[PDB]
Amino acid sequence: GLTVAQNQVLNLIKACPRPEGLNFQDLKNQLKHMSVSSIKQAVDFLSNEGHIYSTVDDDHFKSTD
């Protein structure tokens, strides 16, 4: 039940293979159509639903998929 924007965020996280995952700057770099609040909300939703988790700190994310 993902919005278009949540799916876009999730796809970017899925595509980063680094063990610490991608970071919030990587999301801002790519998601140039989205407000910072929308990116943050999508990260919250994805994290609450178990699609992603934070890794080395609260600004880095990896997907469970």
Partner: peptide, 26 residues
């Protein structure tokens, strides 16, 4: 990554997979 960082990441990975299972099961 350091030992400690890998330990924390794996704990986080398991917490998230747990949340996912709960959502898939509800």
């Amino acid at each position: 990554l350091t030992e400690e960082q890998r330990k924390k990441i794996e704990e986080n990975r398991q917490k998230a997979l747990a949340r996912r299972a709960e959502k898939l099961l509800a």
